Amino acid sequence: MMAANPWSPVQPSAASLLLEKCLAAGVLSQNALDQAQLEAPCFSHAEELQRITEIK
Partner 1 sequence: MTGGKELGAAVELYERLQMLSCPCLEGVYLTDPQSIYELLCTPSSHRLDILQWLCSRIYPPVQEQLSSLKESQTDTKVKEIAKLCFDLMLCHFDDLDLIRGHASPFKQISFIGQLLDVIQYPDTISSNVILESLSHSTEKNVVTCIRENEELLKELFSSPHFQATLSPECNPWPADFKPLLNAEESLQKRATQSSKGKD
Partner 2 sequence: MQSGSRPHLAWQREHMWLALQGLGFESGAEAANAGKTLVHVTFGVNMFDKPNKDAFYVVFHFLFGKLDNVRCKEVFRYCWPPLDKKRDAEFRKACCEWLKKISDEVGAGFPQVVASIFLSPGGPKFVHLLYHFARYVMLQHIKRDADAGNVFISEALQSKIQDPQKALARNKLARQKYLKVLQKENLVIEEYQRKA
Partner 3 sequence: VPEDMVEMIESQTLLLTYLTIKMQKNLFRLEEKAERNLLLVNDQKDQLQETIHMMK
Name the site residues for partner 3 (rule: CB under 8 A).
42-43, 45-46, 49-50, 53, 56
| Binding site partner of 38, from partner 3, partner 1, partner 2, none, Cβ cut-off 5-8 A by kind | partner 2
Query: Would you tell me how many other CB atoms lie within 10 Å of the CB of residue 12?
Result: 13
Q: CA separation (Å) from 31 to 10, 24, 36, 39, 45?
A: 24, 14, 9, 16, 32
Asked if residue 33 lies in contact with residue 23, where contact means CB atoms within 8 angstroms, the answer is yes
**Residue 51 touches which of partner 2, partner 3, partner 1, none (Cβ within 5-8 Å per kind):** none
Where do contacts with partner 2 occur on this chain (CB under 8 A)? 9-11, 13-16, 18-19, 28, 32-33, 36-38, 40, 42-43, 46
